[PDB]
Design a protein around this ligand. Sequence first.
Ligand code: CFM
Ligand code: CLF
Ligand code: CLF
Ligand SMILES: [Cl-]
Ligand SMILES: [Cl-]
Ligand SMILES: [Mg+2]
Ligand SMILES: [Mg+2]
Ligand SMILES: [Mg+2]
Ligand SMILES: [Mg+2]
Ligand SMILES: [Mg+2]
Lengths: 519, 519, 478, 478
Amino acid sequence: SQTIDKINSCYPLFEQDEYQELFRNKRQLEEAHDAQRVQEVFAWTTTAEYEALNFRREALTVDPAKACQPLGAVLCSLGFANTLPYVHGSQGCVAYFRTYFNRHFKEPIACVSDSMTEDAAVFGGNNNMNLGLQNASALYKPEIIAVSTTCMAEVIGDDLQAFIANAKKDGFVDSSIAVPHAHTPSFIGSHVTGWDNMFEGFAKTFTADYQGQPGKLPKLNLVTGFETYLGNFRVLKRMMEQMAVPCSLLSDPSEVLDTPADGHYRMYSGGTTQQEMKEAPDAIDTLLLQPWQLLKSKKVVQEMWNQPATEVAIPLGLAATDELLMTVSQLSGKPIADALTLERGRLVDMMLDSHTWLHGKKFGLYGDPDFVMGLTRFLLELGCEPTVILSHNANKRWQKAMNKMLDASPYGRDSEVFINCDLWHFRSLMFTRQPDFMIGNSYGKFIQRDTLAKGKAFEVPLIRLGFPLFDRHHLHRQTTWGYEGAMNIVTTLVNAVLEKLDSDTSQLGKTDYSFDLVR
Amino acid sequence: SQTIDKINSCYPLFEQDEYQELFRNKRQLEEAHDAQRVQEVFAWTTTAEYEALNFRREALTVDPAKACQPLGAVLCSLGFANTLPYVHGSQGCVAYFRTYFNRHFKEPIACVSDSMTEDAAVFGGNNNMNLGLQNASALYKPEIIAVSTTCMAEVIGDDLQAFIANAKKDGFVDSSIAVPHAHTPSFIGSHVTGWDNMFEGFAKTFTADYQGQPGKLPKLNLVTGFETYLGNFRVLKRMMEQMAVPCSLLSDPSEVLDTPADGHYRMYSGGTTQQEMKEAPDAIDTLLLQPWQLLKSKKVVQEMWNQPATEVAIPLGLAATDELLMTVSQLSGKPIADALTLERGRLVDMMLDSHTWLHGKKFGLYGDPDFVMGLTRFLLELGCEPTVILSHNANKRWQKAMNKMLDASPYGRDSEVFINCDLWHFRSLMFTRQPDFMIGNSYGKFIQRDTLAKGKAFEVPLIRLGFPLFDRHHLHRQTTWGYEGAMNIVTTLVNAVLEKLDSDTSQLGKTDYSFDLVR
Amino acid sequence: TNATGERNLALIQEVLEVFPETARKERRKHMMVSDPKMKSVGKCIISNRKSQPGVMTVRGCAYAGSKGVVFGPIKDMAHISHGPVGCGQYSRAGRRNYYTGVSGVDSFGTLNFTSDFQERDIVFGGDKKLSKLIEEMELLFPLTKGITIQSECPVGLIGDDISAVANASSKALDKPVIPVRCEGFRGVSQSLGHHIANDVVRDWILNNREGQPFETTPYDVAIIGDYNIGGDAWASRILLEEMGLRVVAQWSGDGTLVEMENTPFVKLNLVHCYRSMNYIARHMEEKHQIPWMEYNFFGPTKIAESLRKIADQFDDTIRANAEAVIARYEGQMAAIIAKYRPRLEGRKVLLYMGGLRPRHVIGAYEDLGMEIIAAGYEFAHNDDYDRTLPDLKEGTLLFDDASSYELEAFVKALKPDLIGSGIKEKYIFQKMGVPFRQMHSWDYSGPYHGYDGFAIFARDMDMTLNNPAWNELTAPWL
Amino acid sequence: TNATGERNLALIQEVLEVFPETARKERRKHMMVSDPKMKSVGKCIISNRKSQPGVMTVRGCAYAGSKGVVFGPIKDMAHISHGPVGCGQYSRAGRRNYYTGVSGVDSFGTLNFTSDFQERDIVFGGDKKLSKLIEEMELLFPLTKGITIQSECPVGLIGDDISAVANASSKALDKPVIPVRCEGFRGVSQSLGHHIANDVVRDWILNNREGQPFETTPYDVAIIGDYNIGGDAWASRILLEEMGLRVVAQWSGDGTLVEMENTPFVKLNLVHCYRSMNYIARHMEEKHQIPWMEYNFFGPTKIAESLRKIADQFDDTIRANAEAVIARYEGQMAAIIAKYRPRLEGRKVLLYMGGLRPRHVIGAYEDLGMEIIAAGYEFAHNDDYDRTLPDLKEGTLLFDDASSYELEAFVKALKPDLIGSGIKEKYIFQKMGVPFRQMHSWDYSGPYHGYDGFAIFARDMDMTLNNPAWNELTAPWL
Ligand code: CFM
Ligand code: CLF
Ligand code: CLF
Ligand SMILES: [Cl-]
Ligand SMILES: [Cl-]
Ligand SMILES: [Mg+2]
Ligand SMILES: [Mg+2]
Ligand SMILES: [Mg+2]
Ligand SMILES: [Mg+2]
Ligand SMILES: [Mg+2]
């Protein structure tokens, strides 16, 4: 039933007595396992014995913490001006890529498919590529159609390069349109590998025949890699303007992922221009800001553009932002701006003001390899203990570097690093290692729920930092790099500590001797 | 007892068995009321019967939601360059003003007293002023010593103007030091009244005999009134720079309340200069951004400076920011910047993306009069219902204007406005009117706890927006005005809704049918 | 046709002018204007054809239709996304097919089980990995009633034989292990995944309890094709039980393998989503002699019609019960209409969704005085378009598999007051200033079926169509 | 003096050259360098004088000493801040004087009760408003055991007579209603508030159960002067009760009016804070013949000394119990010294707090190997300076009622590794790059008293002195 004055949605409508009776009656038709047995199995999934069997898995993956290559090629493509992402293969992939980013950014996402079906599985998709380029050009009028692939296209052996050459030769795509491409097999690597592969395709299309000269333009290019915080693209440009060092980001989707609601839909907005990409070889250098995934991009910068590819750490935290600015200053010969030194000192003031709530706290964390290395480094620098560190898509070379960093820190003595493991593995580790908090994406909500069901004392609350963020709004506007981003991270971590302590001390007459007004 | 590997602070040390036993033994020596009598009385304090008795109070105040005048004068004074706040009177007041601001800002606060004691109660505080100005000048070398008063001084009727003239004539304070003063009785009005009184004193000192001409300088002055978010001072400057309209804030403490932790203590930093205050009468106009408390400041602008004092609403929310920029545009003759219109459209996009979680949500709210009117306005703009609206320090003219605004709106039909009521009144209203959430400062934490003790179904979660904020860190850096501040408010409100819905739907096997990944 | 009809036919021509000639002529057959007197579309429209390459179709694939739609909701089985990692991650907990249970323990719909194919699985085949996977799953997830294997693109292309794996693992586990060849390149949309899945259910599930004792009643039914979005099926089930029927099974929202195996013992199949499950309904009629009928639980006019027609398949006791249920909810309905119809009356709506809702929700809109001015489907067939004709006003634009371009162009010309469509359409049309409601996920609200759902539907249409922010897209100085 | 004493005497001279000549000469009498051969400060320092006008003294007022410190902690009474609204708001829940109870119902320490004076109260006087406030209090807060009236500055100045009101209201309510003339213009600091409050307790509380029966034991004691900061008095009470004593009363941390009224029946008064409650301890010895002794529960050296001396006042049973308790916690103490002393030893500390802790915590710092290079007090008296001398190393700087200038100059010159002081000092010294712990509020940690408190104190000094952020104040390019 419903009353006119207070209509209830699904929750809490289904809490009403008539629905509780409905569920009891429906349960008698399911041959449910008894509550006692379901309780016994739940408890057993929280144990060290279950954990050991869980870590024996060699074939089953459960609750992955990674996506597939073409997702990352689509996001890289969205960062160039007047560019339409196009994925050669089957159309279900593009419906899912669009939806995935729609739900994180709360924005429209343009991307087409060429709809290979059973016919193309047998003949190859050259007809789909010709008609696809033709129809997309007509409807959407892109200046650039950036092509990646789905696993069907990869398995059948479609020769991308040849197909696009044929479309050009036969008049399906005009000479005015650039068609960079990359092979992006979802059975290799993850979405971060797709981004890097797509970037190399843009570098070849726009610069391979160019005779460049490093430092002809007194600028620095910056490459972010796969990044889903709009504030990170923006802060980099803002800091470079304060340094007075000309800069281009190469792949910047921050304007097309934040168009105004003013009565007009704008499929294209901002992005790296063709001029920026074409003149990239003349910069002083290109700084690859997520170095573990930007592998082919580093070969572009050194082997194609003959630039230094100065090594930089992900600019997450105080010390990694100091190191980025000293690198920019050294390469450009320009001093670090006094407004940047002032910002740095305000971050240090915040770190000193909030240190007594953060020191010694224990965190689990997961995400992409570059993000997890940067956040683990900043947690050590805060005097926190990153006890459980997981990256499903990281490799053995990364793991060796992480263990080297942790061994060298007093705050890494109890840390364990896991690669090629998933969120069902992370779930056991929250039960057995029980850190104070876990930093993750929206998939971590179910692990917080699971730990709470063992008991209030076993709950590990989630702090949302990563991708995808689907169950809170407008977190994708935030910043996590630079001093600005480190201010967000410090604030987020200390207020997570303080919200949890207030909740724990909020029981009137019982634990509210320590529900302190001032903290 | 304590274990070496896991030392527990107060909570949760006192949860241990030995301390639960200690408490049982101590309780036998207190003649405690019986547990059932205490439960009975607590349940009685949550009723409508109790609320009616509570609303009959005429003399007792419980949990006030305001502070006293000198606190406001000290904050106003901190906004001027090289200015030392000085409170003529008894020293206890100054320890408490410094401490109150220390705990909100997490920063040092310079302020002196002249320590009037029983002797000064007899002879007047003239000697304390003379010695106090000489000793403060010597040790702290201010350019400006900004004098306000404690209630002792006011009751005794010390003649501030005459004391300060005598000090200069007798050589206790150098003639070059500016010594603006104001009478700030704490038995009149509140801390916002102090701020406005202090501002009138600065304006007398720096402009009394000035032959000004509005529009001689093509600038606008802005006056914020009592405001404790650093981002509001900063967003106003940023928007005026985008508008390309010269501007001065008159009283801007945002640099001295955020100096860097760089190995140096800076008592003075930034602030309105003497040149900005002295040339203030030559601006086109002065915009008073919190109009209900800036009463004597409006008389300054209009009577002393012969400027319009163009009426403006507090720039909180979308429509009120729009009106601010249209007013700036009309007075200056400059167009609204394209970057501001883009920022506006992004706020509207956020509003449309989040509206289904905010529409129809009910809120209680309290704080200073200008803030409560602004936030009530914006909540109506969002399609929210501000059902319980309280401002302890507001007057009947403000209450009439609030009911007029509410009556005109589709979303104000169940809204009740309370003036000269305190947080013990608000606590009753949270039990009887039960809004979904309450917006307040850290004192609201006790009301959340009280409502939760009646039961989980009755809990009214607190959203922290206001002053003071003592139990979370670094919220004082946020912005609440302009489009930037409205983005913060929208994100805060929607994510509070979603955090509470996740907690309510996080019970494994019971309410997690609606524990949705995507919201 | 009438004037509205001419304007829509001219709009059709203007929109299709942008298409290369070959696609232009093909696309013209996917749109028409309705005639109140027509009973079937005949040659006026064509549907269920391949999408045009490169146009930004809204459609998904057959794995979405099988895993995402039909099998994914079944709570007591583990569904394995077999192939590389994307498909299973993008479709993890995106569809609100509600169920109750203990996640990871006796109910698995929010977990993402996958065989995470790597290059060695493509070069050597995935069946050995699949077999080992299922052993590991049985060890760590002992309370599953059965397991399904949902094939992603690579599986059939590399020549794997998951049926042999399923048969072997089912013997070792002593539980049903169900192979599905729902690779996303098969068919043209989500629709073939439905059909594939119904055929799989027919052969691997439906006969498992043949010849077993089951205690029946005369008023036993199955709800066929309700996936419990936001609890829609619970809000439908309660009315059928209030009317004196027993709902033995729900396919497949909050559904179970056990309920599905008991479905051949019911007296009547009640088909809500015709598109996705008419196949199995027709099959049970042919093999088990169970009658079936279509019904509609959107809004009071269609719910009363449906309750009366369902009751009319039984006896006078159920008929009288149908009348008593409608009278019991009359007050509630009248108060919802009296509050919200005045706020919505006369507003015009454009609807674009999968295979059922574009026609199924029109009665609820009309119960709040709203008018549909255009309706289209992603992947419906001609029998769905036939079924749409009785509920359209003359001259209405009716269309199939629209590109983003076409949908944007229709909205700019028609100027609907409200759009009902999906997540990839929401944030485009909101920036264009058109109030938008997600009519797949219910924009995180619902349920919308049944009497309890109509109240929510009405609150939600009012909330969004009349929200104050729609008057603020244009700055006040412009 | 030694080379440290000389350097400190030259520093005193250098720092005070900033003061106008007369204040310079006055201020020179408030600092000295310690001499281990001195039993008394004699003429070497002066204290408990008026503060210098305009210098930014750390001190508070007599209302802070009475309401904020002595009476405010008493959980079963309602304390009224009588005057304008500031005083009671700034002091609302700022001091962590922990207690258990049900807020607003049987326990009131986090509520702010005020008479919120307005101009009409100044003009016509506030006694009638006070009387009516107390009637409304009793209607709305019926489970108070008693009420106190804490005067703010204006009350005595306008000639009000709150003792007449308290007498009338106490008869009207039939509960104790206690008037306190603790206006902030009285005295020079918090100190006179303590003394005022002790005199009020003497006259209005301590005689309330005189002549009445009370069941005693031979081991009854009261804790006098422990305000339970972060549960310090609970961490102390547990050791006394483990030693076989019965703690009949705790003044006033987690304290009650009842416990205070039963204090005249005890066998021994145990004074932790000498400054704030020596007055009432001396009064109880003279009137009730109850002996008292000072003790110190900071760190293992002082705890064992204190437990043995307390037990020596009873008999061999309690003497043996003191050795058993000390033995019981010896492993915990050895583990704390083994983990944290190596991380702290050798480091130098500067302390500046109110009236007790600047000397009282020195043993616990010395147990962790740390050295005190300077110690001062806001408002202590010369008998507190006398009691400080035994725990200082020769040449230590010892000073009284410092301005902020003087504290900043001492810090700059002495370069302590760690500072312990208050909230107004915290954020200045952190910016100067000196690790800082709040030694009033325990920087939201504690307890620090007792064996369980020593663990937390060691954890906290290590956390802050050795935090990695102190190596980051200078940018690396600077
Ligand atoms: S788009 Fe239903 S034929 Fe199928 S997931 Fe939505 S209009 Fe599907 S009603 Fe159903 S629950 Fe659906 S809303 Fe038939 S199931 S392939 Mo997207
Ligand atoms: S049409 Fe459908 S969703 Fe597409 S693959 Fe095919 S079954 Fe699947 Fe999963 S992994 Fe990624 S998204 Fe594909 S490219 Fe390889
Ligand atoms: S020395 Fe002490 S704290 Fe000062 S007034 Fe006096 S008792 Fe009180 Fe409360 S209201 Fe404000 S702060 Fe004062 S000026 Fe009138
Ligand atoms: Cl890696
Ligand atoms: Cl007002
Ligand atoms: Mg958006
Ligand atoms: Mg600070
Ligand atoms: Mg009204
Ligand atoms: Mg169940
Ligand atoms: Mg109690």
